[PDB]
Curated annotation (Swiss-Prot), chains A, B:
DCTP 2 binds at E75, K78, Q89, K121. The keyword Transferase does not apply. DCTP 1 binds at H39, H41, A418, E419, N420, L421. This is Anaerobic ribonucleoside-triphosphate reductase. It comes from Enterobacteria phage T4. Homodimer. Forms a tetramer composed of two NrdD and two NrdG subunits. One of its GO terms (molecular function) is metal ion binding. One of its GO terms (biological process) is 2'-deoxyribonucleotide biosynthetic process. Zn(2+) binds at C516. Activated under anaerobic conditions by NrdG, a tightly associated activase. Its EC number is 1.1.98.6. Keywords: Metal-binding, Organic radical, Oxidoreductase, Zinc. The modification Glycine radical is found at A527.
Length: 534, 534
């Protein structure tokens, strides 16, 4: 919404920031950006200010040790309701100190300890008031306290989303314990109910569920009942999306399932000075997306594609992207942890820096990821006349490997969500080449490696075609399948998940999600849920 | 804190806004502002954007009817914990759509109904689980639920204060019912405990308590026990401040005690089209403060004060202030309720406007107040050689009466908090006249009609000297008394309150509030609590 005060103030800061970037970013980078050769994301935040992008918040480390929120020294919560309330408070803090999404990974595992304190208190209350059914009481009341907790989290998020922007992601699914199972059902059931009187579909927090054999994949795993609720939820509210724990670990090289930071940014395995695999508290430093159809367009001589020209534009644009990413990483030199206490001093990034410490040292040596985005492989294939998707991407990775070796920053290939960039690249390519059949004519570029829409493909076929890209674009990727109402056909939906889980990493399903308020109309046309009526 | 991201972004919007104001405010107003003749407050928000200033939120009307928060249709809360959580969510909404303080008046009365729903549920739970002590159970658990509710509100406020700014005020004291009494003690007890591990003193929400004979003034009123807790609270955390219900109603002309909007802005009695006295949902449109010592300084000829010159500067500066206030009120013409749905469409301003309705119509005919501020009566008295405080103010009111009759807006005389303006006026007057003994030498002007500090005056004397100004500056006023540690002398403190309550409207007491964390050092040097170490 643009007429709203919070949005107007933000555009003012954004205008000042785009102006400042103009005086800080080397001219050749800004022109390539203005012309649509590449896209420097979030130029309205960075580099005017030394913001970072998305992250996995180290909530576990914050709740167990304490942490300062303002001047107040917060202590380990003593109940589930107070721990999700604190989670919501951390969410508000983190959202205003980075410009990308914030993720709370494995809330079933992390919050589990507070469901137990809540249970214990209801047992201590079963005797103190001489309650007959002591165990079934502590069970009932605890159930209700976890439910209430996640209902309150959802409304907290909903308010932030309207008093500011805030993309937050909640992941779970690997926990088996009874506490962990209760959190999962609590999250899934609040979602199914929806928001407010008319139980509408919320756009955040995004929900992502880990599915794994032995946990909740097959009819006989401990949590198959949850997968069933999860399926009902997805049919009614689109989320959760799912991640195949199996493929996810092979891609990331990580011992435990890696939750995306924001929409789909994936970290790669990393160890601290002592051999420990750290996930939570890590972040991403920014995205610079390469316009791939445009490298191909700029390679035409007359109406003919020139292969040797392409190779030169590709190589030179790769160095250009590198230069763009480094420009912003350099904007972080000399910035102090005073810039964002919640992130650098109080534990959200998993370490404890002193006011006067430089924040950049924390991101070095593979700890933070750095993103080289891309878009439009479908349109690129068309302009070059054959399918070079897997090939061009594999080559980008080899460049990325050298960048990583030269600088120590962990560059990875990222499948840009490009909710708007999909229009912006197409429109700037069009000002130069006009309507190009099958490329710029439709008005937008297809996202990353997705098979274009307008392609009568079955779900399994689409999944089978996209799956290899998940093992290539390691920094971020997702696959979508369009499906009709699956509310009375949960086995259908499950069939697709099962296939997805087996072949790829991160997956979600787009179906219509509406209600005759006698209305609530949601669609995932690009990356987020939205009312297509707007 | 300035190095922090949220603050930096805000300064950017503020810079753009001061620039825009320069192209919208008539030149003669901006110069008078630049030179320190007057002070247009919040120029970093308005008029660049059609923001209003402070308000009493119509929480009662929002909780009982429903209201939309984003797209979610919120319903009457079913528990005390959920109603204060919603209150906190409304607080975040309101703070980001106005630039001044937000007040929740009489939370003891307004929230009372949810303490009863919470009680009922614990009774329905006393039987369902066969509980012996049914009544003492519902009593214990409810007590704890109200306590938990207000503890959660306080931390919510604390987070907002650090992820943005937000001045929020909570008033109570007139409720006698058991539910109302429980809310009051719940608010007072959480405050006494303080925030976090080290139980530090919070700077918000400000707490103000109505004191009244028959309610809680005398040793035998129903709520004298609360006044006693309130006194202990004030000795330990400065708040609450108090308002003499008695004087307050005579000044405002209102049947019920009028809570200040923000720090000390007071509405005057007003009726809707149907004869009803509306308080909640009303607001203030802005403050323009008149530099009084400066009118006197600019009246000196050589080292001598010229009375006839003063009269001319006073008259012309009064018209100037009027012009300044009207300039901004005019900036609101044509602004639609789409600008702030929570405020205009969903009930916070107590009415329900349609997207396409003009917001200005809501403020007309005395509904919103409009502020003419002033400062430095102590320094003015010195420069003119006699005490003309009550006189100059009374004259300002006569001008205000005509302004109100000419425009329909309810202009009132306002005792500007001037946390910074006290330095800014003095420093600009100094660039012109230099060090002036007893006036600009010390570096700041005394607030409104306060007796300057540096004056060995007893508390009752100070109270007796300031009290008449509360019946004059009807738009906003307060009186402070400095006192040493009164923790082991609550009768002393009570003596002062009692005297204050009898003679004036709004009162608070400044004492030292510290803790050897073996530190937390708070002082109210100007208008808010603060760590004088900064
Ligand atoms: N919305 C809230 C409520 C509490 N806290 C903080 C204050 C303490 O440092 C820590 C402890 O929380 P509690 O679990 O103790 O909350 P209660 O005091 O309400 O429950 P109890 O009296 O059972 O401890 O959490 C917080 O950050 N945010
Ligand atoms: N053509 C564009 C591109 C961006 N933006 C705005 C919207 C966002 O608030 C901000 C973020 O811009 P990005 O530069 O990151 O572009 P995207 O939002 O499309 O990409 P993604 O969804 O991958 O973040 O800029 C815009 O209005 N128009
Ligand atoms: N932090 C929260 C929690 C709930 N609500 C909203 C959703 C409903 O429209 C209205 C009703 O709240 P409830 O009192 O029903 O909250 P619960 O569902 O947790 O309790 P219960 O199941 O007893 O109704 O409040 C909200 O705005 N903010
Ligand atoms: N000399 C001044 C005056 C104001 N401001 C800034 C601080 C506030 O965020 C914003 C509000 O300014 P006002 O113009 O309203 O001045 P005050 O804050 O002193 O007055 P009051 O406490 O009555 O709001 O401008 C400032 O830095 N220096
Ligand atoms: Mg506690
Ligand atoms: Mg409910």
């Amino acid at each position: 919404d643009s007429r709203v005060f919070p949005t107007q103030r933000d555009l003012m800061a954004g205008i000042v920031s785009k102006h400042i970037a103009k005086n800080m970013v080397p001219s050749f980078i800004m022109k390539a950006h203005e012309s649509g050769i590449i896209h420097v994301h979030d130029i309205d935040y960075s580099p005017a200010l030394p913001f970072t992008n998305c992250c996995l918040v180290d909530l576990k480390g914050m709740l167990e040790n304490g942490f300062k929120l303002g001047n107040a020294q917060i202590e380990t919560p003593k109940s589930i309701g107070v721990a999700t309330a604190i989670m919501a408070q951390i969410t508000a803090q983190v959202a205003s100190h980075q410009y990308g999404g914030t993720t709370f990974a494995n809330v079933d595992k992390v919050l589990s300890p507070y469901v137990k304190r809540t249970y214990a208190k209801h047992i201590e209350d079963a005797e103190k008031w001489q309650i007959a059914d002591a165990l079934n009481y502590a069970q009932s009341k605890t159930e209700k306290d976890v439910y209430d907790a996640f209902q309150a989290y959802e409304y907290e998020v909903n308010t932030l989303f309207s008093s500011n922007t805030p993309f937050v992601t909640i992941t779970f699914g690997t926990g088996t314990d009874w506490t962990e199972r209760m959190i999962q059902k609590a999250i899934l059931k609040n979602r199914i109910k929806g928001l407010g009187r008319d139980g509408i579909t919320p756009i955040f927090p995004k929900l992502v569920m880990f599915v794994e054999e032995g946990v909740n994949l097959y009819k006989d795993d401990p949590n198959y009942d949850i997968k069933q609720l999860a399926l009902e939820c997805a049919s009614k509210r689109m989320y959760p999306d799912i991640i195949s724990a199996k493929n996810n670990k092979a891609i990331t090289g990580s011992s435990v399932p890696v939750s995306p930071m924001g929409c789909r940014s994936f970290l790669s395995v990393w160890k601290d000075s002592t051999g420990n695999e750290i996930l939570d508290g890590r972040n991403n430093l920014g995205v610079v997306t390469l316009n791939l159809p445009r490298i191909a367009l700029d390679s035409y001589i007359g109406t003919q594609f020139n292969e040797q020209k392409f190779v030169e534009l590709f190589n030179e644009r790769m160095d250009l992207c590198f230069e763009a990413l480094m420009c912003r990483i350099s904007s972080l030199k000399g910035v102090k942890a005073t810039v964002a206490p919640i992130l650098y001093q109080e534990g959200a990034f998993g370490v404890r820096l002193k006011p006067d410490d430089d924040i950049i040292e924390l991101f070095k040596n593979g700890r933070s990821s750095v993103s080289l985005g891309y878009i439009g492989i479908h349109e690129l294939n068309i302009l070059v006349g054959r399918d070079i998707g897997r090939e061009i991407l594999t080559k980008m990775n080899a460049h990325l490997k050298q960048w990583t070796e030269r600088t120590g920053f962990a560059f990875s290939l990222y499948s840009t969500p490009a909710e708007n960039l999909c229009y912006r690249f197409c429109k700037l390519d069009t000002e130069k080449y006009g309507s190009v059949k099958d490329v710029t004519d439709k008005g937008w570029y297809t996202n990353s490696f997705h098979v274009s829409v307008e392609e009568n493909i079955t779900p399994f076929e689409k999944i089978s075609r996209e799956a290899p890209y998940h093992f290539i674009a390691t920094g971020g990727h997702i696959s979508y399948v369009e499906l009709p109402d699956m509310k009375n056909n949960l086995k259908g939906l499950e069939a697709v998940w099962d296939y997805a889980a087996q072949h790829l990493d991160y997956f979600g399903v787009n179906m219509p999600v509406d209600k005759c308020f006698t209305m609530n109309t949601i669609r995932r046309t690009c990356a987020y849920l939205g009312n297509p009526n707007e």
